[PDB]
Design a binder for this molecule. Structure first.
Ligand SMILES: COc1cccc(OC)c1-n1c(NS(=O)(=O)[C@@H](C)[C@H](O)c2ncc(C)cn2)nnc1-c1cccc(C)n1
Ligand SMILES: CCCCCCCC/C=C\CCCCCCCC(=O)OC[C@H](O)CO
Ligand SMILES: [Zn+2]
Length: 347
């Protein structure tokens, strides 16, 4: 348990430090549309790793904060700011893939570069405003131990004499809504509309090169616009060379940007679902009144839920090295940079 957290800090600073460097090293006119959200995700994951030496020492001494009041406020604020920001970056990535693949409006009216620049400014402004009450409510002090001080959320500042639970559940449910429920629903809607257009795959002639598009079809021969290639009558031949349906190959479009988007979302959902499910169940446990044995599990699973959420911060650079070919190409170029460095030092 303590050795695992120490490994995350080592893989986080070097991992996210590489991701941030690879995007910045790329040319001004050679940058991808998704790169603006990739760079912002790297900044969010990097600052998330900076809060680990404050959190790991706190867990070692079993809930003890020897840093201060301002450090308890800032670290807790940065943890939640980056919690919303990383989720909003994936929302931007999914919407970027939606506007490009689906295309709801005209190509000139879409403004993909403009929309991306607007979304990145709005997400960083929202993440700071939404996580703002966290910094205000967080304060250091003795709870029961007296000799050992702990950094906790003190609801007494805004709540009345009995509405202390109401604010914990009020801010708690909204955090799951803003940070997971709303972004994941947009993520699911984007993926659904993307798969909807892809559903009817293109077929190309291996003889002449006729690119059959299911959207346009072939109304000159009899194929209605919207007919799938498999739904086409068996008597139909190529309108350019007259070859059978058996001489056509399926267009397996190498959608690399969607592969980076899906993998990052799936891994995020696997690392954010146990943290958000245990939290919501604990908040609902006081209102719905769940059994004594059920609440005992959630209290012991939660410190491990915060562990797997920290894993996601250092797991992302590994995913860029397995599915993204652009990051793999810049990695080899980084060793070539070190090869010219050793060649310039001796010549
Ligand atoms: C803002 O970081 C903190 C700093 C110090 C202590 C903390 O506490 C565990 C957090 N913290 C908090 N506070 S909490 O809301 O008061 C929390 C204690 C809540 O009462 C609760 N829920 C579920 C159960 C079963 C019991 N009790 N919630 N999440 C995190 C967190 C931590 C690390 C990484 C991530 C992604 N998140
Ligand atoms: C203004 C919107 C406030 C959102 C609530 C929030 O940031 O979440 C607090 C959370 O309960 C802390 O653990
Ligand atoms: Zn043909």
């Amino acid at each position: 348990i303590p050795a695992i957290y120490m490994l995350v800090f080592l893989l986080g600073t070097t991992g996210n430090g590489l991701v941030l460097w690879t995007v910045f090293r790329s040319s001004r006119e050679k940058r991808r549309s998704a790169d603006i959200f990739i760079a912002s995700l790297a900044v969010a994951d990097l600052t998330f790793v900076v809060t680990l030496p404050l959190w790991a020492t706190y867990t070692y001494r079993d809930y003890d904060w020897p840093f201060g009041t301002f450090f308890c406020k800032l670290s807790s604020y940065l943890i939640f700011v980056n919690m919303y920001a990383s989720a909003f970056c994936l929302t931007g990535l999914s919407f970027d893939r939606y506007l490009a693949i689906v295309r709801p409006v005209a190509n000139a009216r879409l403004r993909l570069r403009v929309s991306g620049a607007v979304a990145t400014a709005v997400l960083w402004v929202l993440a700071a405003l939404l996580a703002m009450p966290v910094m205000v409510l967080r304060t250091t002090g003795d709870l029961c131990n007296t000799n050992k001080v702990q950094c906790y959320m003190d609801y007494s500042m805004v709540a009345t004499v009995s509405s202390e639970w109401a604010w914990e559940v009020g801010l708690g449910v909204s955090s799951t809504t803003v940070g997971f429920v709303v972004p994941f629903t947009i993520c699911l809607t984007c993926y659904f509309f993307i798969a909807q257009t892809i559903a009817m795959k293109k077929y190309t002639c291996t003889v002449c090169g006729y690119i059959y598009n299911p959207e346009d079809g072939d109304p000159d021969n009899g194929v209605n616009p919207g007919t799938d290639f498999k739904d086409i009558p068996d008597d139909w031949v190529c309108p350019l060379c007259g070859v059978g349906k058996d001489q056509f190959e399926e267009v397996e479009e190498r959608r690399r940007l969607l592969s980076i988007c899906v993998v990052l979302v799936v891994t995020f959902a696997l690392c954010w679902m146990p943290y958000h499910l245990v939290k919501t169940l604990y908040m609902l446990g006081s209102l719905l009144h769940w059994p004594c044995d059920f609440d005992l599990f959630l209290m012991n699973i939660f410190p491990y839920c915060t562990c797997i959420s920290y894993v996601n911060s250092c797991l992302n650079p590994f995913l860029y090295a397995f599915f993204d070919p652009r990051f793999r190409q810049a990695c080899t170029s980084m060793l070539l940079m070190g090869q010219s460095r050793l060649e310039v030092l001796f010549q």
